[PDB]
């Protein structure tokens, strides 16, 4: 018979949503099984829904969205066999048995849930899109017959990728955050264009060598050392190899279509192989063992560059990079920043923890909105100990004005431009600090540092 809306849909937030779908005024208004069969789609995301009790009566649903709610039970879906697309990411679903017979599904999105058992998916052979990442899946057996899949993601405990053998239609695969070391099966997925394998245990990438249609590859956070196989993948435009143990970059030298290359957190001391990758706009080389960055002078299209946490003394090869917008090189050994002076398109400069004493070359970088210059530190060349040592202050702000020491060791004092100590007896060093707020464009920072003066006996 004609029931009230809120006795079908027992969940308060869904009752209220269905009221609006059905063109009614209150959630107590009654509706017929005919008013219900009018409803073929339902966008009910982020509405705080806890239960979909009532949805079984919307027999003609072809497409639903219940993402970003608090669903646990999805039994109401069991017999809505006209469903072709389900979006239900970001809930608390564990049991997906109710999906087992919805064989007309072409799209199923379930990432960010609590699913372990995916056996109920095994007969959904019309799926071309299946998203299962950020779940607790360890066994992907049930996938072996879903041969029409073009996009697939899953996590987060899979070791055995063999069930993927016949999924040869796959173009996009995300196996991020699993426990995979053996990727032999991926040799069979020759139509892959995008492979995301962040955060696994992969050391042998030989299987990828014939995946020549890959344009996007991430092996971020794996166990890579030898990357020789990547030389085959000449269609790559986007490559992430960050957080591995890579030192030899020769295999990348011919990958001239690369516009993005992430190599941070590796064992790299020679970037000569990168010299010909002139299409690069983003290059990340933080957390390596770099000193010589001369090959970077050829990469004229670079807009973003990271070099932080390296052993770099001379930054000057960057002077030709006129399109640079972001440059992070904190924690290096740079003293002279005169090579940065004509990089006027920089809006973000992060140069703390260097050996910078003179900011005057930064004065015309007026598109800066973010700036970091703290915690500089250097050691002067030793001078011979005597009771009265004085050294010049060389610390200059963006104006060219000397910055007066903030602290001076061993009771010393300052009379511009000189710092003077009176030392009773031998000490093997003196020091001073400086600390001054500075603004360049609209970016504000503390320019601070410690200068050490060794004293020889």
């Amino acid at each position, epitope marked *: 018979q004609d029931t009230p809306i809120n006795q079908i849909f027992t969940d308060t937030a869904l009752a209220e949503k269905m009221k609006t779908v059905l063109g009614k005024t209150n959630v107590t208004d009654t509706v017929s099984q005919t008013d219900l069969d009018q409803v073929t789609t339902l966008q009910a995301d982020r509405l705080g829904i806890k239960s979909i009790d009532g949805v079984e009566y919307l027999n003609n649903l072809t497409q639903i969205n219940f993402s970003n709610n608090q669903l646990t039970d999805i039994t109401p879906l069991k017999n809505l066999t006209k469903l072709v697309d389900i979006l239900m990411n970001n809930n608390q679903i564990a049991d997906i048995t109710p999906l087992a017979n919805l064989t007309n599904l072409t799209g199923l999105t379930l990432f960010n849930n609590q699913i372990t058992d995916i056996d109920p998916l095994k007969n959904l052979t019309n799926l071309n899109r299946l998203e299962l990442s950020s779940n607790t899946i360890s066994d992907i057996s049930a996938l072996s017959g879903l041969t029409s899949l073009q996009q697939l993601s899953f996590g987060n405990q899979v070791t055995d990728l063999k069930p993927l053998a016949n999924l040869t239609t796959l173009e996009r695969l995300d196996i991020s955050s699993n426990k995979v070391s053996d990727i032999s099966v991926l040799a069979k997925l020759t139509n892959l264009e995008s492979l995301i394998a962040t955060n696994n245990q992969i050391s042998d990438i030989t299987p990828l060598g014939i995946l020549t249609n890959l344009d996007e590859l991430s092996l971020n956070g794996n166990q890579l050392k030898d990357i020789g196989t990547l030389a085959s993948l000449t269609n790559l435009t986007d490559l992430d190899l960050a957080n591995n143990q890579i030192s030899n970059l020769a295999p990348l030298s011919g990958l001239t279509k690369l516009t993005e290359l992430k190599l941070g957190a590796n064992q790299i001391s020679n970037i000569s192989p990168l010299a010909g990758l002139t299409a690069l706009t983003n290059l990340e080389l933080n957390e390596n063992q770099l000193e010589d960055i001369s090959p970077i002078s050829n990469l004229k299209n670079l807009t973003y560059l*990271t070099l932080y*946490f390296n052993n770099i003394s001379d930054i000057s090869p960057v002077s030709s990079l006129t399109k640079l917008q972001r440059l992070f090189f904190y*924690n290096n050994k740079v003293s002279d920043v005169s090579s940065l002076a004509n990089l006027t398109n920089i809006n973000w400069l992060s140069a703390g923890h260097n050996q910078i004493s003179d900011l005057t070359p930064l004065a015309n970088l007026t598109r800066i909105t973010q700036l970091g210059l703290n915690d500089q530190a250097w050691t002067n060349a030793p001078v011979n100990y005597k009771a009265n040592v004085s050294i010049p202050n060389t610390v200059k702000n963006v104006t060219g004005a000397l910055i007066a020491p903030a602290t001076i060791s061993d009771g010393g004092s300052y009379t511009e431009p000189d710092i003077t100590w009176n030392l009773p007896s031998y000490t093997n060093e003196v020091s001073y600090t400086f600390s001054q707020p500075v603004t360049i464009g609209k970016g504000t920072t503390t320019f601070s540092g410690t200068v050490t003066q060794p004293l020889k006996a």
Partner: nanobody
Amino acid sequence: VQLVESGGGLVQPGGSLRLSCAASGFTLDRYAIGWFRQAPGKEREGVSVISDTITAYRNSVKGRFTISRDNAKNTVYLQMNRLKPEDTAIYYCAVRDRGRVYSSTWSGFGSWGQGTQVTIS
């Protein structure tokens, strides 16, 4: 990802203390590891960071503190010498994923431990 700080205590001005940041449930090789501290009514502030073998230190502790790792023990240490009253604080360790990019030495840290109280009389 679980971090545990220990080694805090009461110490005389000019004295020394060694903190340990013991990590369990993940390889420390995948993370940069940072020591932070927070004094009463102040912001939590970075003290030192190690990423692989490269280290960084806030100005006020340069020359006095040394961060180091024992990879065998999955532990990061902060050697604090010539301690001053200004170094009084609860000391915390945290990590950040070395596979990302960060705009500063101190940004992006998380998985904070319980902390260890350092008091200089």
